[PDB]
Design an enzyme around this catalytic site. Structure first.
Site, PDB file in Angstrom:
ATOM      1  N   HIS A 285     102.556  87.670  55.140  1.00 60.45           N
ATOM      2  CA  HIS A 285     103.586  87.809  54.104  1.00 60.45           C
ATOM      3  C   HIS A 285     104.914  88.253  54.694  1.00 60.45           C
ATOM      4  CE1 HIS A 285     105.177  88.228  50.056  1.00 60.45           C
ATOM      5  NE2 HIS A 285     105.957  89.111  50.642  1.00 60.45           N
TER       6      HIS A 285
ATOM      7  N   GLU B 263     111.608  95.811  50.326  1.00 62.99           N
ATOM      8  CA  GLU B 263     110.616  95.092  49.561  1.00 62.99           C
ATOM      9  C   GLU B 263     109.409  95.883  49.113  1.00 62.99           C
ATOM     10  OE1 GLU B 263     109.481  91.313  51.196  1.00 62.99           O
ATOM     11  OE2 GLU B 263     107.661  91.190  49.965  1.00 62.99           O
TER      12      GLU B 263
ATOM     13  N   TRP C 170     101.671  83.156  44.270  1.00 56.70           N
ATOM     14  CA  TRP C 170     101.427  81.831  44.804  1.00 56.70           C
ATOM     15  C   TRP C 170     100.001  81.497  45.198  1.00 56.70           C
ATOM     16  CZ3 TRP C 170     106.281  81.140  48.379  1.00 56.70           C
ATOM     17  CH2 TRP C 170     107.180  80.281  47.725  1.00 56.70           C
TER      18      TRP C 170
END
Ligand code: ATP
Lengths: 98, 196, 110, 224, 197, 110
Positions: D34, D128, D25
């Site tokens: 983040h 993640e 992005w």
């Protein structure tokens, strides 16, 4: 007793204040099309009833979760006076109440 | 190897139509199969052509001979007499403190007027089970505090060292391969503080 | 009132609601809409309304209550024991939730 | 050992993904904003990181719930119970870095008060791994496509494979991603409810096929 | 400069040992004694010997020493045999009318054993009012169970609320407070002008 | 116990916990581990364990509980008045906490 039910409104305002010798919390329910539905619940100046607490904590989750809720006021005997929250329902998170 | 509730736990007055009274839990077939005397006892107490319901299967009275017949969950509930076990067993062990480190809470479980439990897990393995109730038990009064932290650690990753009192044993989860006891303490893991 | 306890598998709690218990004012109802994860839009188990009584005398959240809150925020598959008795939620009846255990997998939740 | 294969749930189809992959992005590569959700929020999406997860089961349960949503939308007369979701499989290189570690390291460079308890509990939750900048076609291997018709109650799994996929012999970076302390103001960790999903995950997936409700984990992780 | 100064009567009849000011009372600061004439006097006419006392962040050489106020370190002189403790509650005596402050944001939380939970509500840097809640004692103890819930919510969320306080009671829990501090009696996640504020 | 009350600044609660009161069936402790910003892993102030009683007969959360919850969640630096008494948390003595105030700046947190 002109009850009513509103579905798919979000809690926009929440306020715990004092009212005489009784505390009283109120919420504003909002749907882009309509006017504000508004209701309050007040300790009946009566003990035992975990009621006031129970519902306050629930209404706080509805506010915190930014979820659409489905409430049921009971019309105030006087205009410009909010009604009573009779029961509150948290619709499916991320969705709508059928 | 499933934990086999003790024969002693067996509710003389089982629940009607699958409604074992709060405090009790329907006995499963795997448990009844592995419970020697509970079974013997059963022969000695089931007047023939009588069928009693379990969680899964059914018990064909000693007329058929006493048969543990499998069946779907809730299926055997159709009959009038369901087999149940009370879920709390007084180990009669000393009231000492035992703990399990690096666990995570999972598998919540609630009854009506009974406990709230959770199965604590280390790397895949189900290390131990812990319960807490505001209704009965020793640490009966520590419930309102524990629940709040059980709820937090459950709701977030947060590893933990759980403190359990092998004092009392609980049989709330059906067919377990871990044992459950009374929860007395939680301590978020902290390496530096030499906790986990 | 239904006639016998129903065990429902693989259900998720979809919506919670607080309400006054029609009868005694020492109690209130904590009702919901349980729905079998994956079922068909019209499938019977796609909309299973339940309730359970709360004692307004005792302070704090009951074990049931702490779970309903946890599984409903995380959307966790359960195994609910419903009935036999029935309370009212939305005019139509509702089975009394009487126990709930989360699902470790297919072994316990088919 | 750093994982070799990661996963990414998405509302984008193979004909797109298999050609172009995912490309970050923005430039903001601050590891805290983040995991915290700042660099993935409306009028603030700038994370130079493509959120992916090392646990397929994770992506599995998310899609499995995004579907149950469609089923409930239609029930409210808000849809047609239909859902199509994908679960891309990816070959990770050193350009992939762990979210948790990244978090922890940040905290041990700026001290406890600079991090957020839940932001770190979340990175470990979603397992993640941060794709720095972009995750290109050659890294994209297979792709499960799940179709569900809420009305019939029928689910339909389907696979496809990217031709352009290239077989290397990589794994994720064994080293923590690193960034200058955030001068940004962070109130808490932005997360999507039911199941709890990080904002950069839940957010990044949705595309061109009603805003997402992002909440402060902190306001809900503890009772009232 | 510009620090609310405890009224003389907040002092307690006897100082406390080991630095452990008693519950519902708290150590006096260097900066507060200084600004309080009434206090200095009090200590002067009541302190014999070559005595030195512990103040929160400093020392008071009284008696034969004159009545000297030496700058210290937070708690750093709690080894002395006596620390000067102030009481924290004051029955202002004012009427229980409502006072509200809009656009405020609860910050800087304070708590203590058997006492009250407080917060400093700021507005663009600058504090505005301090408010506290306590189930333990207080005209408004009832509202604790309810207030602590909204307080915690707005605190961890950064929710710009509109706070209501009753000046019927004044608390001195914070140290060297540029702001006054009264009893909390309501909070409102509010819409500008809302009849609900 | 310790001789006198210690005041510690810039402490960040990093672990939390509950246990029973090693001597009372009517109380229990809520413990923690606090760390002072900038200290060494070696440094003693790198993990100061504390605890405070909670009365198991008065339903609710104490003003001190509400705060620990909040500041732990947001990782807020504190000024803690630990002492002088000692309680046991994880088989080790830990300083009792009698008062804590959020640091507003270097002024109040040296
Ligand atoms: N999101 C929710 N879903 C289901 N039940 C909820 C939800 N939020 C709150 N509850 C319940 O509503 C009631 C009140 O919750 P609340 O958090 O206000 O207080 P509590 O959990 O009872 O704890 P306390 O004793 O601190 O008041 C209980 O049934 C609480 O678990």
């Amino acid at each position: 007793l002109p009850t009513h039910l509103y579905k798919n409104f979000t809690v926009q305002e929440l306020a715990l204040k004092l009212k005489g010798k009784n505390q009283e919390f109120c919420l504003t329910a909002f749907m882009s099309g309509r006017s504000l539905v508004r209701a309050c619940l007040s300790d009946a100046g009566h003990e035992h009833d975990t009621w006031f607490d129970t519902m306050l904590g629930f209404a706080i989750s509805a506010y915190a979760l930014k979820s659409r809720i489905a409430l049921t006021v009971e019309d105030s005997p006087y205009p410009g006076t909010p009604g009573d929250l009779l029961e509150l329902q948290i619709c499916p998170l991320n969705g709508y109440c059928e | 190897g499933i934990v086999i509730p003790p024969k002693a736990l067996f509710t003389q007055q089982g629940g009607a139509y699958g409604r074992c009274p709060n405090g009790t839990r329907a006995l499963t077939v795997a448990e009844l199969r592995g419970n020697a005397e509970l079974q013997t006892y059963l022969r000695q107490i089931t007047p023939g052509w009588s069928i009693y319901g379990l969680y899964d299967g059914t018990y064909l009275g000693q007329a058929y001979g006493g048969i543990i017949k499998d069946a779907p969950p809730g299926a055997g509930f159709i009959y009038r007499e369901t087999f149940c076990i009370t879920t709390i067993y007084k180990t009669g062990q000393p009231a000492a403190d035992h703990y399990y480190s690096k666990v995570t809470a999972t598998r919540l479980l609630a009854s009506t007027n009974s406990r709230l439990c959770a199965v604590f897990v280390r790397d895949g393995q189900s290390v131990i089970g812990a319960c807490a109730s505001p209704y009965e038990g020793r640490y009966r009064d520590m419930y309102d505090a524990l629940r709040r932290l059980l709820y937090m650690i459950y709701m977030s990753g947060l590893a933990v060292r759980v403190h359990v009192s092998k004092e009392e044993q609980y049989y709330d989860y059906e067919d377990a391969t871990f044992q459950t006891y009374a929860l007395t303490g939680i301590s978020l893991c902290n390496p530096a503080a030499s906790i986990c | 009132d239904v006639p016998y306890v129903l065990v429902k598998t693989n259900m998720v709690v979809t919506s919670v609601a607080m309400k006054p218990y029609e009868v005694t004012p020492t109690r209130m109802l904590v009702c919901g809409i349980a729905a079998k994860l994956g079922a068909a839009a019209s499938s019977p188990d796609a909309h299973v309304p339940f309730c359970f009584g709360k004692d307004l005398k005792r302070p704090g959240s009951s074990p049931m209550e702490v779970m309903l809150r946890a599984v409903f925020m995380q959307q966790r598959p359960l195994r609910m024991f419903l009935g036999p008795k029935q309370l009212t939620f939305e005019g139509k009846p509702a089975l009394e939730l009487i126990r709930m255990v989360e699902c470790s997998g297919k072994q316990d939740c088919p | 050992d750093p994982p070799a294969t990661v996963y990414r749930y998405d509302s984008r189809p193979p004909e797109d993904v298999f050609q172009n992959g995912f490309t970050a992005w923005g430039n903001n590569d601050n590891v805290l904003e983040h995991l915290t959700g700042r660099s993935c929020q409306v009028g603030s999406s700038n994370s130079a990181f493509v959120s992916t997860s090392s646990s397929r089961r994770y992506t599995e349960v998310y899609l499995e719930h995004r579907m149950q949503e469609a089923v409930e939308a239609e029930r409210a007369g808000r849809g047609t119970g239909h859902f199509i979701g994908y679960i891309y499989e990816v070959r990770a290189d050193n350009n992939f870095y762990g979210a948790a570690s990244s978090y922890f390291e940040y905290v041990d460079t700026y001290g406890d008060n600079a991090g957020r308890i839940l932001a770190g509990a979340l990175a470990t939750y979603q397992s993640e791994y941060l794709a720095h900048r972009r995750i290109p076609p050659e890294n994209i291997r297979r792709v499960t496509r799940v179709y569900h018709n809420g009305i019939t109650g029928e689910t339909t799994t389907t696979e496809y494979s990217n031709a352009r996929y290239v077989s290397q012999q990589t794994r994720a970076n064994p080293n923590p991603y690193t960034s200058r302390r955030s001068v940004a103001s962070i109130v808490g960790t932005l997360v999507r409810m039911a199941p709890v999903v990080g904002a950069c995950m839940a957010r990044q997936a949705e595309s061109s096929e009603e805003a997402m409700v992002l909440v402060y984990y902190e306001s809900i992780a503890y009772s009232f | 400069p510009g620090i609310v100064i405890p009224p003389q009567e907040q002092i307690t009849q006897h100082g406390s040992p080991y630095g452990r000011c008693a519950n519902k009372t708290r150590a006096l600061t260097v900066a507060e004694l200084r600004g309080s004439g009434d206090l200095q006097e009090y200590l002067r006419h009541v302190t014999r010997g070559w005595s030195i006392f512990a103040l929160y962040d400093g020392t008071y050489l009284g008696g034969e020493y004159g009545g000297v106020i030496k700058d210290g370190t937070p708690g750093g002189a709690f080894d002395l045999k006596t620390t000067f403790c102030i009481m924290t509650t004051r029955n202002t005596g004012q009427p229980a009318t409502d006072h509200y402050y809009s656009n405020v944001t609860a910050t800087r939380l304070l708590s203590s054993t058997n006492s009250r939970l407080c917060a400093v509500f700021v507005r663009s840097g600058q504090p505005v009012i301090g408010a506290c809640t306590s189930p333990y004692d207080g005209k408004y103890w009832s509202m604790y169970s309810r207030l602590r819930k909204m307080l915690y919510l707005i605190y961890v969320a950064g929710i710009s609320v509109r706070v209501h306080v009753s000046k019927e009671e004044q608390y001195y829990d914070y140290e060297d407070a540029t702001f006054e501090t009264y009893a909390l009696t309501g909070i409102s996640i509010c819409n500008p002008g809302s009849s609900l504020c």
